[PDB]
Structure formats: C-alpha cells, structure tokens
Design a protein around this ligand. Structure first.
Ligand SMILES: [K+]
Ligand SMILES: [Zn+2]
Length: 393
C-alpha cells in the first residue's frame, strides 16, 4: 500500500545508535529497537525499512569518505553535492552549512572512541550522519499519504546547532519538500504533543519559513526542559503574544502563527479529554474549514512525544520545580490513554472525512522514554492506525 507506511530503521541503522543519550534509562539504541520489534510483531502493517532505499552515488561517496576519516575529503565531497538533489536541497534549506560541517567533523572525530560527546544531551557515532540522512531519504523518497516514522528525534534541532537528543530537524525538511513538490504551497499545520517545547523547529520556522502559511500548535510544560515560557517567547519574536484562551498565547510573524499550549496554565476539568488536545483539535477542525472554502490543501505534521503521558518516569517530563511530580498532579497536567486514543481517533476521522482537503499526514517520534509506558502507547497508536488508515482484512 502506497496509502500509508510505518518507518523503522533497519538492523544496521538502529545498531549504529548505541551510546546515544535518551532522557530515560536506556540509550536510543535499545529504545528504538524495542519499538521496532513490537511494530514488526504486530501482524501486518505497511512497514518500510531504511535499508532498502538506496541513495544516489554521490551520497554513498560522502558516506564512504566519512568512514575512512578524511575530514577534508568529506568536507569537500559534501560541498560539491548537487544543489538540486532532493535530500540536500531540503537539508540545507533548514540547516546552516557551518553546522553540517561541524557535524560531519564530529562524526569522523568520533571514530576514535566510537562516540564523541558534545554536551550532556548530544552524542554522535561515526555513522550518525549516514543514518540521519538514510532516515531522511526513505521518508522523502516514498509516496505515503500518511507517514508514521520511528527514528531519532528532531524538534529540538536548531538551524545552526543540535540540542537535547536532536541533531537535525527532519520535520522542517519534510515541510521543505512540500513547498517545492506542490504547485502552490500547501497550508501547513503542526501539532507537537511531546511534553518538551518545540523550541528548535520553532526557530527554523520564524527564520526561514515565516512566509509560508503555518499554524503551529505547540503543546508543552514550561516547567520541565527547557524552562521556556511566554516571557521567553516574547524575547524570541520580539513581540507580545496575545492571550487567546486558557492562558495560551499566539504569536504572528508574517505568515506563521505559533500557539503555545502551556500545560501548567492549562489544567483539566474533572472528566473529559484534556483541554490541551481539545484546543489542538478545535484548531485543526478549523484549519481544515479555512483551506476547504479557500480551495488550498493541507499538510499535517505530528511531531509527537509520549513523555507527555502521566505514566512517564523520565526526568525531562516529570521533575517539576525541584521534585518529581506525583500521581495527583500528573493526572491534572499530563495525558492518559483516554486522551490520546481520542486525539488519534479524531485526527484520522478529520482526515478520512476530508481527503479532498487534508493532503499528507506525517507523524514522527520525538519523546516518550519509559519502556512499559511507551510500549503500551504504541499498541494504542498501532491499533488506531490498523482501524482508520488501513484497508481491512
Ligand atoms: K511540544
Ligand atoms: Zn520530549
């Protein structure tokens, strides 16, 4: 089926992720491997693997150069890649050439100890670069209208540095290939439910994409990583984001709209789906109607983390002002399978009922670190897909 796919790294690609930090107790290798074993075992889903997609020669040669250690050969070989190759045009539409040099540089500089530690949250192996790109390849090179991909995370990656387990911003590049693959740019909408703020992806959209039409609903808790609240955004947009509702502000910069759903200020009303994701759906219910009666299409991007679950034990989702948040507060500020299952079910319903307006869906794995929590949430996620987005058997 070209209509939907589910993307995991291959054996080799996943294997070259050891020592790569996660905000949990396991490295990113175990973490992603566990999810992949589950996804392969859950019967028959349309599952694609980063080993089968072969890149053009010049990519395979930049890779090869990285392996033998010639930092000037790699630096040069990459500089001379075709400016119109599908990967690279999107890659350098969001990432500075100096960052990519420094990165290639780190991968090779890493080959000694098998790993090069940049800062507390950023490690690279020799093959980090090959995988980051072999990942970005397969998503770019595959015509799936509803893409769920399980790889290394992205919404903290900046146009110019890496931060917090993120090395490049695969989401923004995927938006790049959408502005250019379409005749008229699609109306963009992002909903990122990872409990840590999409600080990175946000900077890249203010900087390089403010002219595209993007509605970006960013759900996070200004109390965990990275401690940034509305005052911090004000200094970022050097404007003052107006309050639209449940202590949630919006900023406009040219054609980009950024909504900050802060989970501290937005607490839940006894029973019913968490107000944070009800606004996420009120705004995606509307963005669909706007683009219908205007005729344009919509590309829908879900950079989703599960550390926003109440059942997350990772420090970066649960250590709130000096102590670990507890089961009472956790249920008033985080999400439970009730909330999530409703959300995913609603999202796909809007899609199925508006395949004339909603165009592509891309869901990409950000946070969610506790093993028994994320394995349960995944089973939920796979079951809603098996029901809504797959032809029945
Ligand atoms: K987020
Ligand atoms: Zn996160």
């Amino acid at each position: 089926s070209e209509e939907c796919a589910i993307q995991i790294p291959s054996e080799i690609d996943n294997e070259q992720m050891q020592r790569m930090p996660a905000g949990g107790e396991e490295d990113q290798y175990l973490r992603i491997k566990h999810m992949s074993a589950l996804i392969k075992k859950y019967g028959d889903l349309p599952v694609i693997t980063t080993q089968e997609t072969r890149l053009p020669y010049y990519w395979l040669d930049l890779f090869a150069a990285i392996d033998e250690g010639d930092t000037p050969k790699a630096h040069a070989l990459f500089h001379l890649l075709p400016q119109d190759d599908i990967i690279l045009r999107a890659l350098r539409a969001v990432h500075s050439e100096d960052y990519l040099y420094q990165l290639i540089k780190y991968c090779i500089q890493a080959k000694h100890f098998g790993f090069k530690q940049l800062n507390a949250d950023l490690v690279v192996t020799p093959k980090t670069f090959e995988i980051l790109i072999r990942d970005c390849a397969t998503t770019l090179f595959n015509p799936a209208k509803a893409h769920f991909s399980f790889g290394l995370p992205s919404h903290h990656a900046y146009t110019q540095m890496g931060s917090g387990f993120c090395l490049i911003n695969k989401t923004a590049m995927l938006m790049k290939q959408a502005e250019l693959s379409s005749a008229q740019p699609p109306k963009f909408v992002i909903i990122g439910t990872d409990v840590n703020r999409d600080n990175g992806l946000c900077d890249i959209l203010r900087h390089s994409f403010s002219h595209l039409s993007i509605c970006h609903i960013d759900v996070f808790d200004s109390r965990v990583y990275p401690q940034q609240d509305f005052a911090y955004i004000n200094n970022e947009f050097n404007s003052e984001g107006v309050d639209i509702g449940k202590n949630i502000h919006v900023w406009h910069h040219n054609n980009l709209n950024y909504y900050a759903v802060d989970l501290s200020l937005t607490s839940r009303k006894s029973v019913g789906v968490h107000p944070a994701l009800l606004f996420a759906l009120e705004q995606l219910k509307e963005s669909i109607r706007e683009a219908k009666a205007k005729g344009q299409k919509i590309a829908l991007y879900l950079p989703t983390g599960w550390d926003s679950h109440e059942d997350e034990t990772a420090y970066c989702g649960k250590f709130v002002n000096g102590r670990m948040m507890g089961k009472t507060a956790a249920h008033q500020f985080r999400f439970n399978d009730g909330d999530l299952g409703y959300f995913y079910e609603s999202i796909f319903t809007l899609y199925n009922e508006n395949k004339d307006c909603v165009d592509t869906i891309y869901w990409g794995l950000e946070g969610g670190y506790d093993r028994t929590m994320y394995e349960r949430e995944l089973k939920i996620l796979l079951q809603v897909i098996e029901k809504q987005l797959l032809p029945k058997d």
